[PDB]
Amino acid sequence: MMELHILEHRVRVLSVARPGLWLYTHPLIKLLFLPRRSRCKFFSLTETPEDYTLMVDEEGFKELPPSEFLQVAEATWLVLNVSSHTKIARSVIAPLAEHHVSVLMLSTYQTDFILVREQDLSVVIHTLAQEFDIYREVGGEPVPPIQSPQNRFCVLTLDPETLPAIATTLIDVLFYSHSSITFFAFSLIEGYISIVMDAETQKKFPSDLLLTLWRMVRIGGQPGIVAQIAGPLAAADISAYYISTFNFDHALVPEDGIGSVIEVLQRR
Amino acid sequence: MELHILEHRVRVLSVARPGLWLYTHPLIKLLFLPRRSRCKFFSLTETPEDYTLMVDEEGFKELPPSEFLQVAEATWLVLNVSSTKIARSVIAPLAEHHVSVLMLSTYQTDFILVREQDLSVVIHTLAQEFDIYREVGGEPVPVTRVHPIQSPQNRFCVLTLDPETLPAIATTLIDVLFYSHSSITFFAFSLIEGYISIVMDAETQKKFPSDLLLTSSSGELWRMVRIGGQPLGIVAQIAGPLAAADISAYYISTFNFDHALVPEDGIGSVIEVLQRR
């Protein structure tokens, strides 16, 4: 009935250490603000107290030199999106984890992306052929146990042609700003802009540009958990935004029920 | 008729093009974030040879070593005449006393950079025609103690800009400076004491938003004369000749060449005077 689409993007996952981020000001800026200079179509940038986790297609990957501040996940990743015409947890990540496949969840303002190794593509088609109808984009056509800080997050989108109006204030946040977690998310994917940022980080930005109450739960290890969270929250389903970084996995649920989401996440 | 010595202590260096990316992070801070730098004198000039950077000591502390970097060993002071014919009354005599100078004409004022080594001589040479002041505690205090010419055909514009609208052009400006690629490629941006001066091409002027860059009655645009040379190791031979014709010009010195910008409809009359000498 429903549909699960596999998209063209060939994503690479990087971890740029914080003290090294500046060595990549030139590349990342090209990917952030200058559409007409990089053919990249999938750009995800996340800031966490451990590092800056990046996800970029192969075309946006040839512009990031290797270095000591930069550790790359040696796997290539494909993108999955559910459509019809968020019950995603129990229908995508529980069958996935049951066969011990790891998934990187990246929910955005527009859609939710499930990232999988390409070596594990053979299983997602078989463990799932009968829950959805699986499509694959050929061209532009579809052919068949840890912490939570007190930060209050906003998930905002942005008209692409207004990105310059914030460029500076955005650059300032990422390359020059050094509970109470520092967390930031910016993703330009297929020309769609999504950002997660706390409340007084939005105070930095002008008033009415950021077009549109959340809160963070968090857990993961260095270098399966996303399924634990996803299944613990699908039980008595609530809304959530899942973002996977190099080390941790994050979920953003509304404030009004944060406590409940910590009761279900801790018993499991 | 006043001569002011400003408190700026400027360093002058050259960034080779292959390495400009390595300085995107510091440069951007100096260009767009006037709070995370105590620098208040900043100038960046793109020529075909290299990028030239004139930056005070605070902004100089923001730049890391590199093989693409060539820093002039000397510290420089900035001179300014108060109430662009600085030639016949400053550059000419100082040149007669064998004092090299680095010009930096901006939309707001014309800066004359001299090494502190030469400072004394400068006073010795100009105390008779100007009352020389020095900026102590932010206050102007009276002090008692063989070269061919290149004439590109680009049409340059001299623009200033309201600082409170600089972000609106940021993405464009960055694109022009860090990610781009008879004529020559020449681009000037300077922020000094909160004033922005940009020299641009008209082909480069199309890429920017509308109704932000401000020009001085420029229906007539500008043309460049450019006398070449090697690294920091000659404006007298452009300023003084050009002084005879009482014609005004924007002077800009870079690490390897010297540039004068004259109104366009007189460019020929300028080149004439320049090849006599």
From Swiss-Prot, chain A:
Variant or mutagenesis effect after changing residue 112 to A: No effect on arginine-binding. No effect on homodimerization. Loss of interaction with the GATOR2 complex which constitutively activates the TORC1 signaling pathway
List of residues binding L-arginine: 102-103, 225-226, 245-249
Origin: domain of life: Eukaryota
Residue list for modification Phosphoserine: 15
Entry's localization field: Cytoplasm, Cytosol
Modified how: Phosphorylation at Ser-15 by AKT1, promoting the interaction between CASTOR1 and RNF167.
Gene3D superfamilies: VC0802-like
Outcome of swapping residue 15 to D: Mimics phosphorylation, leading to promote interaction with RNF167 and subsequent ubiquitination
Coiled-coil boundaries: none
SUPFAM superfamilies: ACT-like
GO molecular function, one term: arginine binding
Effect in UniProt of substituting residue 117 to A: Decreased arginine-binding. Constitutively interacts with the GATOR2 complex
Tissue and organ expression note: Widely expressed.
Consequence of substituting residue 247 to K: No effect on interaction with the GATOR2 complex
GO cellular component: cytosol
The entry's keywords: Cytoplasm, Phosphoprotein, Ubl conjugation
Domain spans labelled ACT: 73-129, 213-266
Protein's GO biological process: cellular response to amino acid starvation; cellular response to L-arginine; negative regulation of TORC1 signaling; positive regulation of TORC1 signaling
Family, similarity comment: Belongs to the GATS family.
Biological role: Functions as an intracellular arginine sensor within the amino acid-sensing branch of the TORC1 signaling pathway. As a homodimer or a heterodimer with CASTOR2, binds and inhibits the GATOR subcomplex GATOR2 and thereby mTORC1. Binding of arginine to CASTOR1 allosterically disrupts the interaction of CASTOR1-containing dimers with GATOR2 which can in turn activate mTORC1 and the TORC1 signaling pathway.
Domain statement: Based on x-ray crystallography data, the protein would be constituted of 4 tandem ACT domains instead of the 2 predicted from the sequence.
Assembly with partners or alone: Forms homodimers and heterodimers with CASTOR2. Interacts with the GATOR2 complex which is composed of MIOS, SEC13, SEH1L, WDR24 and WDR59; the interaction is negatively regulated by arginine. Interacts with TM4SF5; the interaction is positively regulated by leucine and is negatively regulated by arginine.
Protein name, entry field: Cytosolic arginine sensor for mTORC1 subunit 1
Species this chain originates from: Homo sapiens (Human)
Gene expressing this chain: CASTOR1
